[PDB]
Amino acid sequence: GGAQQRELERMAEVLVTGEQLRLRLHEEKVIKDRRHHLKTYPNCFVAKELIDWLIEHKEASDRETAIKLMQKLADRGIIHHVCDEHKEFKDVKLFYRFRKDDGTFPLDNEVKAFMRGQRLYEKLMSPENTLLQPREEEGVKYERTFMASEFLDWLVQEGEATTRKEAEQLCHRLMEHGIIQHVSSKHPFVDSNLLYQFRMNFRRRRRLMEL
Amino acid sequence: GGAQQRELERMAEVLVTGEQLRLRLHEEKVIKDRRHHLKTYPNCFVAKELIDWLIEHKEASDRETAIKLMQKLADRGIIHHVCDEHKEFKDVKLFYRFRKDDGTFPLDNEVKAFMRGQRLYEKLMSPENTLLQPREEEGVKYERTFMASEFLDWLVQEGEATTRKEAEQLCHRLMEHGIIQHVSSKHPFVDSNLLYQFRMNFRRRRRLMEL
Protein backbone atom coordinates (compact mmCIF):
# COMPACT_ATOMS: atom_id res chain seq x y z
CA GLY A 1 0.00 0.00 0.00
CA GLY A 2 2.62 2.49 0.93
CA ALA A 3 2.34 6.23 1.25
CA GLN A 4 -0.80 6.45 -0.91
CA GLN A 5 -2.78 4.02 1.24
CA ARG A 6 -1.56 5.56 4.49
CA GLU A 7 -2.68 9.05 3.45
CA LEU A 8 -5.98 7.87 1.95
CA GLU A 9 -6.65 5.99 5.20
CA ARG A 10 -5.94 9.20 7.13
CA MET A 11 -8.42 11.04 4.89
CA ALA A 12 -11.18 8.44 4.86
CA GLU A 13 -11.21 6.27 7.98
CA VAL A 14 -12.25 8.95 10.47
CA LEU A 15 -15.09 9.90 8.12
CA VAL A 16 -16.22 6.26 7.91
CA THR A 17 -15.91 5.57 11.65
CA GLY A 18 -17.45 8.96 12.48
CA GLU A 19 -20.49 8.18 10.35
CA GLN A 20 -20.84 4.78 12.05
CA LEU A 21 -20.91 6.61 15.39
CA ARG A 22 -23.56 9.09 14.21
CA LEU A 23 -25.89 6.25 13.21
CA ARG A 24 -25.35 4.44 16.51
CA LEU A 25 -26.06 7.61 18.48
CA HIS A 26 -29.34 8.20 16.64
CA GLU A 27 -30.48 4.62 17.28
CA GLU A 28 -29.65 5.10 20.99
CA LYS A 29 -31.29 8.55 21.23
CA VAL A 30 -28.07 10.20 22.42
CA ILE A 31 -28.69 12.58 19.51
CA LYS A 32 -32.13 14.18 19.71
CA ASP A 33 -33.94 17.50 19.55
CA ARG A 34 -33.02 19.29 22.78
CA ARG A 35 -34.60 22.37 24.34
CA HIS A 36 -32.58 24.98 26.25
CA HIS A 37 -34.38 28.10 27.51
CA LEU A 38 -37.54 27.39 25.51
CA LYS A 39 -35.41 27.26 22.34
CA THR A 40 -35.13 24.05 20.33
CA TYR A 41 -31.80 22.92 18.86
CA PRO A 42 -32.48 19.87 16.63
CA ASN A 43 -30.41 16.70 16.35
CA CYS A 44 -27.97 17.54 19.12
CA PHE A 45 -25.92 15.58 21.63
CA VAL A 46 -24.35 16.99 24.80
CA ALA A 47 -20.56 16.87 24.89
CA LYS A 48 -20.33 15.71 28.51
CA GLU A 49 -23.08 13.14 27.95
CA LEU A 50 -21.32 11.73 24.89
CA ILE A 51 -18.09 11.38 26.88
CA ASP A 52 -20.14 9.48 29.46
CA TRP A 53 -21.56 7.27 26.71
CA LEU A 54 -18.19 6.57 25.07
CA ILE A 55 -16.71 5.37 28.36
CA GLU A 56 -19.96 3.61 29.27
CA HIS A 57 -19.76 1.57 26.04
CA LYS A 58 -15.98 1.00 26.32
CA GLU A 59 -15.16 3.06 23.23
CA ALA A 60 -12.78 5.22 25.30
CA SER A 61 -10.52 4.37 28.23
CA ASP A 62 -11.05 7.57 30.22
CA ARG A 63 -12.34 11.13 30.04
CA GLU A 64 -9.09 12.51 28.58
CA THR A 65 -8.93 10.04 25.68
CA ALA A 66 -12.64 10.37 24.87
CA ILE A 67 -12.07 14.12 24.53
CA LYS A 68 -9.14 13.51 22.17
CA LEU A 69 -11.27 11.27 19.94
CA MET A 70 -14.12 13.78 19.68
CA GLN A 71 -11.54 16.53 19.09
CA LYS A 72 -10.36 14.57 16.04
CA LEU A 73 -13.93 14.51 14.72
CA ALA A 74 -14.35 18.21 15.50
CA ASP A 75 -11.06 18.99 13.72
CA ARG A 76 -12.24 17.21 10.56
CA GLY A 77 -15.61 18.98 10.59
CA ILE A 78 -17.55 15.82 11.41
CA ILE A 79 -19.10 17.44 14.49
CA HIS A 80 -19.35 21.06 15.56
CA HIS A 81 -20.46 23.05 18.56
CA VAL A 82 -24.03 24.30 18.16
CA CYS A 83 -24.06 27.99 19.06
CA ASP A 84 -27.08 30.29 19.27
CA GLU A 85 -27.77 31.70 15.82
CA HIS A 86 -30.31 34.51 15.97
CA LYS A 87 -33.15 33.72 13.57
CA GLU A 88 -34.35 37.33 13.46
CA PHE A 89 -32.33 39.78 11.38
CA LYS A 90 -31.80 43.01 13.31
CA ASP A 91 -30.13 46.39 12.78
CA VAL A 92 -27.17 45.49 14.99
CA LYS A 93 -23.40 45.01 14.81
CA LEU A 94 -23.45 41.24 14.41
CA PHE A 95 -21.58 39.16 11.83
CA TYR A 96 -23.66 37.51 9.11
CA ARG A 97 -22.62 35.19 6.28
CA PHE A 98 -24.13 33.91 3.04
CA ARG A 99 -24.59 30.16 3.24
CA LYS A 100 -22.66 29.77 -0.03
CA ASP A 101 -19.68 31.37 1.76
CA ASP A 102 -19.84 28.85 4.61
CA GLY A 103 -16.77 26.65 4.86
CA THR A 104 -17.03 23.26 3.17
CA PHE A 105 -15.15 19.99 3.63
CA PRO A 106 -14.76 18.74 0.05
CA LEU A 107 -13.15 15.46 -0.95
CA ASP A 108 -10.89 15.22 -3.98
CA ASN A 109 -11.48 12.59 -6.65
CA GLU A 110 -8.78 10.22 -5.36
CA VAL A 111 -10.35 10.10 -1.89
CA LYS A 112 -13.83 9.61 -3.37
CA ALA A 113 -12.58 6.70 -5.49
CA PHE A 114 -10.80 5.20 -2.48
CA MET A 115 -13.99 5.35 -0.39
CA ARG A 116 -16.13 3.95 -3.20
CA GLY A 117 -13.55 1.20 -3.68
CA GLN A 118 -13.52 0.25 0.00
CA ARG A 119 -17.28 -0.33 0.03
CA LEU A 120 -16.94 -2.57 -3.04
CA TYR A 121 -13.96 -4.45 -1.58
CA GLU A 122 -15.81 -5.12 1.68
CA LYS A 123 -18.82 -6.47 -0.21
CA LEU A 124 -16.65 -8.61 -2.51
CA MET A 125 -14.58 -10.03 0.38
CA SER A 126 -17.73 -11.22 2.18
CA PRO A 127 -18.60 -14.93 2.18
CA GLU A 128 -21.80 -14.23 0.26
CA ASN A 129 -19.96 -12.82 -2.77
CA THR A 130 -18.21 -15.04 -5.30
CA LEU A 131 -16.86 -12.65 -7.94
CA LEU A 132 -13.29 -12.80 -6.61
CA GLN A 133 -11.62 -16.02 -7.71
CA PRO A 134 -8.19 -17.31 -8.78
CA ARG A 135 -8.27 -17.19 -12.57
CA GLU A 136 -5.96 -17.49 -15.57
CA GLU A 137 -5.12 -15.11 -18.40
CA GLU A 138 -2.57 -15.77 -21.15
CA GLY A 139 -1.45 -18.81 -19.18
CA VAL A 140 -0.72 -17.06 -15.86
CA LYS A 141 -2.59 -17.88 -12.65
CA TYR A 142 -3.66 -14.80 -10.67
CA GLU A 143 -5.33 -14.55 -7.26
CA ARG A 144 -8.39 -12.50 -6.27
CA THR A 145 -9.37 -11.59 -9.81
CA PHE A 146 -12.65 -10.31 -11.25
CA MET A 147 -13.72 -10.23 -14.90
CA ALA A 148 -14.39 -6.75 -16.29
CA SER A 149 -17.75 -7.78 -17.78
CA GLU A 150 -18.88 -9.63 -14.65
CA PHE A 151 -17.84 -6.69 -12.43
CA LEU A 152 -19.92 -4.32 -14.56
CA ASP A 153 -22.83 -6.78 -14.37
CA TRP A 154 -22.61 -7.01 -10.56
CA LEU A 155 -22.22 -3.25 -10.05
CA VAL A 156 -25.68 -2.73 -11.54
CA GLN A 157 -27.46 -5.68 -9.89
CA GLU A 158 -26.21 -4.51 -6.48
CA GLY A 159 -27.28 -0.93 -7.23
CA GLU A 160 -23.80 0.56 -6.90
CA ALA A 161 -24.35 2.04 -10.38
CA THR A 162 -27.50 2.92 -12.29
CA THR A 163 -26.34 1.91 -15.77
CA ARG A 164 -23.54 0.03 -17.50
CA LYS A 165 -22.02 3.20 -18.94
CA GLU A 166 -22.15 4.77 -15.47
CA ALA A 167 -20.53 1.69 -13.91
CA GLU A 168 -17.92 1.83 -16.68
CA GLN A 169 -16.87 5.37 -15.74
CA LEU A 170 -16.63 4.28 -12.10
CA CYS A 171 -14.15 1.55 -13.05
CA HIS A 172 -12.12 4.07 -15.06
CA ARG A 173 -12.00 6.26 -11.97
CA LEU A 174 -11.02 3.27 -9.80
CA MET A 175 -8.28 2.53 -12.36
CA GLU A 176 -7.13 6.16 -12.55
CA HIS A 177 -6.60 6.38 -8.77
CA GLY A 178 -4.95 2.98 -8.38
CA ILE A 179 -7.79 1.21 -6.58
CA ILE A 180 -7.97 -1.55 -9.22
CA GLN A 181 -5.49 -2.80 -11.81
CA HIS A 182 -5.24 -5.16 -14.73
CA VAL A 183 -3.73 -8.43 -13.59
CA SER A 184 -0.49 -7.79 -15.43
CA SER A 185 0.14 -5.06 -17.97
CA LYS A 186 -1.17 -1.79 -16.50
CA HIS A 187 -3.77 -2.12 -19.31
CA PRO A 188 -6.79 0.20 -18.95
CA PHE A 189 -10.23 -0.99 -17.95
CA VAL A 190 -12.14 -2.49 -20.87
CA ASP A 191 -15.63 -4.02 -20.83
CA SER A 192 -14.40 -7.48 -21.74
CA ASN A 193 -13.29 -10.85 -20.33
CA LEU A 194 -9.96 -9.41 -19.13
CA LEU A 195 -9.01 -9.98 -15.51
CA TYR A 196 -8.56 -7.23 -12.92
CA GLN A 197 -7.62 -7.09 -9.26
CA PHE A 198 -7.83 -4.70 -6.37
CA ARG A 199 -4.48 -2.94 -6.15
CA MET A 200 -5.58 -1.35 -2.86
CA ASN A 201 -5.82 -3.97 -0.10
CA PHE A 202 -8.15 -2.17 2.30
CA ARG A 203 -7.91 -2.81 6.03
CA ARG A 204 -10.93 -3.23 8.27
CA ARG A 205 -12.87 -0.16 9.37
CA ARG A 206 -11.29 1.52 12.38
CA ARG A 207 -12.77 1.56 15.84
CA LEU A 208 -12.82 4.98 17.52
CA MET A 209 -9.78 4.28 19.70
CA GLU A 210 -7.79 3.33 16.58
CA LEU A 211 -8.04 6.91 15.28
CA GLY B 1 -46.83 32.36 -17.35
CA GLY B 2 -49.11 29.90 -15.59
CA ALA B 3 -49.01 27.84 -12.42
CA GLN B 4 -45.75 26.01 -13.07
CA GLN B 5 -43.82 29.22 -13.76
CA ARG B 6 -45.26 31.14 -10.81
CA GLU B 7 -44.19 28.42 -8.36
CA LEU B 8 -40.77 27.93 -9.95
CA GLU B 9 -40.27 31.71 -9.73
CA ARG B 10 -41.19 31.61 -6.03
CA MET B 11 -38.59 28.89 -5.49
CA ALA B 12 -35.82 30.36 -7.65
CA GLU B 13 -35.93 34.16 -7.85
CA VAL B 14 -34.96 34.83 -4.22
CA LEU B 15 -32.01 32.44 -4.69
CA VAL B 16 -30.84 34.23 -7.86
CA THR B 17 -31.34 37.73 -6.46
CA GLY B 18 -29.69 36.74 -3.17
CA GLU B 19 -26.71 35.22 -4.97
CA GLN B 20 -26.34 38.40 -7.03
CA LEU B 21 -26.23 40.37 -3.77
CA ARG B 22 -23.54 38.06 -2.39
CA LEU B 23 -21.33 38.64 -5.43
CA ARG B 24 -21.88 42.39 -5.35
CA LEU B 25 -21.13 42.63 -1.63
CA HIS B 26 -17.88 40.74 -2.22
CA GLU B 27 -16.89 43.16 -4.98
CA GLU B 28 -17.56 46.10 -2.63
CA LYS B 29 -15.77 44.48 0.34
CA VAL B 30 -18.91 44.65 2.47
CA ILE B 31 -18.17 40.94 2.89
CA LYS B 32 -14.64 40.19 4.07
CA ASP B 33 -12.68 38.16 6.60
CA ARG B 34 -13.33 39.86 9.93
CA ARG B 35 -11.42 39.58 13.19
CA HIS B 36 -13.23 39.53 16.52
CA HIS B 37 -11.26 38.92 19.72
CA LEU B 38 -8.32 37.08 18.17
CA LYS B 39 -10.67 34.74 16.26
CA THR B 40 -10.95 35.29 12.51
CA TYR B 41 -14.43 34.88 11.01
CA PRO B 42 -14.19 34.51 7.23
CA ASN B 43 -16.47 36.05 4.61
CA CYS B 44 -18.76 37.98 6.94
CA PHE B 45 -20.76 41.19 6.66
CA VAL B 46 -22.12 43.29 9.51
CA ALA B 47 -25.92 43.42 9.63
CA LYS B 48 -26.14 47.13 10.47
CA GLU B 49 -23.61 47.95 7.75
CA LEU B 50 -25.59 46.01 5.13
CA ILE B 51 -28.68 48.00 6.12
CA ASP B 52 -26.60 51.14 5.61
CA TRP B 53 -25.46 49.86 2.21
CA LEU B 54 -28.95 48.86 1.08
CA ILE B 55 -30.23 52.36 1.87
CA GLU B 56 -27.18 54.05 0.34
CA HIS B 57 -27.77 52.09 -2.89
CA LYS B 58 -31.54 52.70 -2.92
CA GLU B 59 -32.41 49.01 -2.56
CA ALA B 60 -34.61 49.98 0.42
CA SER B 61 -36.42 53.19 1.34
CA ASP B 62 -35.66 52.96 5.07
CA ARG B 63 -34.12 50.72 7.72
CA GLU B 64 -37.41 48.98 8.56
CA THR B 65 -37.96 47.79 4.98
CA ALA B 66 -34.27 46.90 4.50
CA ILE B 67 -34.57 44.64 7.54
CA LYS B 68 -37.68 43.06 6.02
CA LEU B 69 -35.77 42.28 2.81
CA MET B 70 -32.83 40.70 4.64
CA GLN B 71 -35.28 38.69 6.74
CA LYS B 72 -36.64 37.24 3.51
CA LEU B 73 -33.14 36.06 2.64
CA ALA B 74 -32.59 34.66 6.13
CA ASP B 75 -35.93 32.82 6.01
CA ARG B 76 -34.80 30.99 2.86
CA GLY B 77 -31.41 30.11 4.38
CA ILE B 78 -29.46 32.41 2.04
CA ILE B 79 -27.83 34.27 4.93
CA HIS B 80 -27.44 33.42 8.60
CA HIS B 81 -26.10 34.93 11.81
CA VAL B 82 -22.53 33.77 12.43
CA CYS B 83 -22.20 32.73 16.08
CA ASP B 84 -19.07 31.57 17.89
CA GLU B 85 -18.50 27.83 17.50
CA HIS B 86 -15.89 26.74 20.03
CA LYS B 87 -13.12 24.85 18.23
CA GLU B 88 -12.00 22.95 21.34
CA PHE B 89 -14.21 20.05 22.42
CA LYS B 90 -14.65 20.14 26.19
CA ASP B 91 -16.31 18.00 28.86
CA VAL B 92 -19.14 20.50 29.24
CA LYS B 93 -22.90 20.82 28.83
CA LEU B 94 -22.84 22.32 25.36
CA PHE B 95 -24.89 21.16 22.40
CA TYR B 96 -22.95 19.57 19.53
CA ARG B 97 -24.26 18.28 16.21
CA PHE B 98 -22.92 16.13 13.40
CA ARG B 99 -22.53 18.22 10.26
CA LYS B 100 -24.51 15.64 8.28
CA ASP B 101 -27.37 16.37 10.70
CA ASP B 102 -27.22 20.11 9.96
CA GLY B 103 -30.28 21.50 8.21
CA THR B 104 -30.16 21.39 4.42
CA PHE B 105 -31.88 23.31 1.63
CA PRO B 106 -32.38 20.79 -1.17
CA LEU B 107 -33.62 21.76 -4.62
CA ASP B 108 -35.62 19.26 -6.66
CA ASN B 109 -34.75 18.46 -10.26
CA GLU B 110 -37.47 20.67 -11.73
CA VAL B 111 -36.17 23.78 -9.97
CA LYS B 112 -32.58 22.94 -10.92
CA ALA B 113 -33.63 22.60 -14.57
CA PHE B 114 -35.57 25.87 -14.36
CA MET B 115 -32.53 27.64 -12.92
CA ARG B 116 -30.16 26.07 -15.45
CA GLY B 117 -32.49 27.12 -18.26
CA GLN B 118 -32.76 30.69 -17.05
CA ARG B 119 -28.98 31.10 -17.05
CA LEU B 120 -28.79 29.67 -20.58
CA TYR B 121 -31.65 31.91 -21.73
CA GLU B 122 -29.92 35.02 -20.36
CA LYS B 123 -26.72 34.11 -22.23
CA LEU B 124 -28.69 33.56 -25.43
CA MET B 125 -30.20 37.04 -24.96
CA SER B 126 -26.77 38.70 -24.72
CA PRO B 127 -25.95 40.96 -27.69
CA GLU B 128 -23.08 38.86 -29.08
CA ASN B 129 -25.00 35.55 -29.04
CA THR B 130 -26.67 34.56 -32.32
CA LEU B 131 -28.11 31.11 -31.61
CA LEU B 132 -31.73 32.28 -31.37
CA GLN B 133 -33.26 32.99 -34.79
CA PRO B 134 -36.56 32.56 -36.63
CA ARG B 135 -36.22 29.29 -38.53
CA GLU B 136 -38.50 26.98 -40.52
CA GLU B 137 -39.09 23.24 -40.15
CA GLU B 138 -41.33 21.13 -42.36
CA GLY B 139 -42.52 24.34 -43.99
CA VAL B 140 -43.69 26.05 -40.78
CA LYS B 141 -42.15 29.31 -39.59
CA TYR B 142 -41.10 29.39 -35.93
CA GLU B 143 -39.76 32.26 -33.84
CA ARG B 144 -36.90 32.29 -31.36
CA THR B 145 -35.61 28.84 -32.28
CA PHE B 146 -32.25 27.19 -31.73
CA MET B 147 -30.85 24.14 -33.52
CA ALA B 148 -29.93 21.15 -31.37
CA SER B 149 -26.52 20.68 -33.02
CA GLU B 150 -25.61 24.37 -32.79
CA PHE B 151 -26.89 24.49 -29.20
CA LEU B 152 -24.74 21.49 -28.22
CA ASP B 153 -21.69 23.02 -29.91
CA TRP B 154 -22.22 26.22 -27.93
CA LEU B 155 -22.94 24.45 -24.63
CA VAL B 156 -19.54 22.74 -24.80
CA GLN B 157 -17.71 25.79 -26.13
CA GLU B 158 -19.30 27.90 -23.36
CA GLY B 159 -18.42 25.47 -20.58
CA GLU B 160 -22.02 24.82 -19.56
CA ALA B 161 -21.08 21.17 -20.14
CA THR B 162 -17.67 19.50 -20.09
CA THR B 163 -18.51 17.12 -22.94
CA ARG B 164 -21.02 16.89 -25.76
CA LYS B 165 -22.87 13.97 -24.16
CA GLU B 166 -23.13 15.91 -20.88
CA ALA B 167 -24.57 18.88 -22.79
CA GLU B 168 -27.02 16.41 -24.36
CA GLN B 169 -28.23 15.12 -20.98
CA LEU B 170 -28.78 18.69 -19.80
CA CYS B 171 -31.10 19.31 -22.76
CA HIS B 172 -33.07 16.15 -21.97
CA ARG B 173 -33.66 17.51 -18.46
CA LEU B 174 -34.75 20.85 -19.93
CA MET B 175 -37.29 18.98 -22.09
CA GLU B 176 -38.43 16.77 -19.20
CA HIS B 177 -39.32 19.76 -17.01
CA GLY B 178 -40.92 21.86 -19.70
CA ILE B 179 -38.14 24.44 -19.94
CA ILE B 180 -37.61 23.85 -23.66
CA GLN B 181 -39.80 22.24 -26.29
CA HIS B 182 -39.71 20.92 -29.81
CA VAL B 183 -41.16 23.47 -32.20
CA SER B 184 -44.04 21.12 -33.06
CA SER B 185 -43.97 18.71 -30.09
CA LYS B 186 -42.95 15.87 -32.39
CA HIS B 187 -39.51 14.80 -31.12
CA PRO B 188 -37.39 14.58 -27.96
CA PHE B 189 -34.11 16.43 -27.95
CA VAL B 190 -31.85 14.77 -30.54
CA ASP B 191 -28.32 15.83 -31.46
CA SER B 192 -29.38 16.86 -34.94
CA ASN B 193 -30.72 19.77 -37.01
CA LEU B 194 -34.17 19.79 -35.36
CA LEU B 195 -35.53 23.03 -33.95
CA TYR B 196 -36.35 23.77 -30.31
CA GLN B 197 -37.64 26.67 -28.25
CA PHE B 198 -37.88 27.87 -24.69
CA ARG B 199 -41.36 26.99 -23.43
CA MET B 200 -40.66 28.95 -20.23
CA ASN B 201 -40.66 32.69 -20.95
CA PHE B 202 -38.45 33.83 -18.08
CA ARG B 203 -39.12 37.24 -16.56
CA ARG B 204 -36.48 39.76 -15.54
CA ARG B 205 -34.60 39.12 -12.30
CA ARG B 206 -36.34 40.42 -9.19
CA ARG B 207 -34.98 43.36 -7.30
CA LEU B 208 -34.58 42.81 -3.57
CA MET B 209 -37.60 45.02 -2.90
CA GLU B 210 -39.71 42.75 -5.13
CA LEU B 211 -39.07 39.52 -3.23
Numbering used by the authors:
A (entry chain B), B (entry chain A): 20 to 230
Task: Share the article's original sentences.
DEP domain-containing mTOR interacting protein (DEPTOR), conserved in vertebrates, modulates the activity of the serine/threonine kinase mammalian target of rapamycin (mTOR), a master regulator of cell growth. mTOR acts in two functionally distinct multiprotein complexes, mTOR complex 1 (mTORC1) and mTORC2, and DEPTOR is the only protein reported to bind and inhibit both mTOR complexes. DEPTOR is a 46 kDa protein comprising an N-terminal DEP (Dishevelled, Egl-10, and Pleckstrin) domain tandem, herein referred to as DEPt, and a C-terminal PDZ (postsynaptic density 95, disks large, zonula occludens-1) domain. Biochemical analysis and cryo-EM reconstructions of DEPTOR bound to human mTOR complex 1 (mTORC1) and mTORC2 reveal that both structured regions of DEPTOR, the PDZ domain and the DEP domain tandem (DEPt), are involved in mTOR interaction. The PDZ domain binds tightly with mildly activating effect, but then acts as an anchor for DEPt association that allosterically suppresses mTOR activation.
To obtain a pseudo-atomic model of the second DEPTOR-mTOR binding interface, we determined an X-ray crystal structure of a recombinant DEPt region (aaDEPTOR 1–230) at 1.93 Å resolution in a domain-swapped conformation as revealed by small-angle X-ray scattering (SAXS) in solution. Each of the two domains in DEPt adopts a characteristic DEP domain fold comprising an alpha-helical core and a protruding beta-hairpin arm. In the DEPt, the two DEP domains are interacting via their N-terminal alpha-helices and a C-terminal extension of the second DEP domain that folds back onto the first DEP domain. (b) The DEPt of DEP domain-containing mTOR interacting protein (DEPTOR) crystallized as a domain-swapped dimer. The domain-swapped dimer is stabilized by a non-native disulfide bridge between C102 of the protomers. The DEPt is monomeric in solution in a conformation corresponding to the conformation found in the crystal structure, which is related to the mTOR-bound state by a simple domain rotation with minor translation component. Binding of DEPt to mTOR preserves the overall fold of DEPt, but is linked to a 3.6 Å translation and 39° rotation between the two DEP domains. DEP1 of DEPt, which mainly mediates interaction of DEPt and mTOR, is more conserved than DEP2. The two positively charged patches in DEPt were recently described to bind to phosphatidic acid (PA).
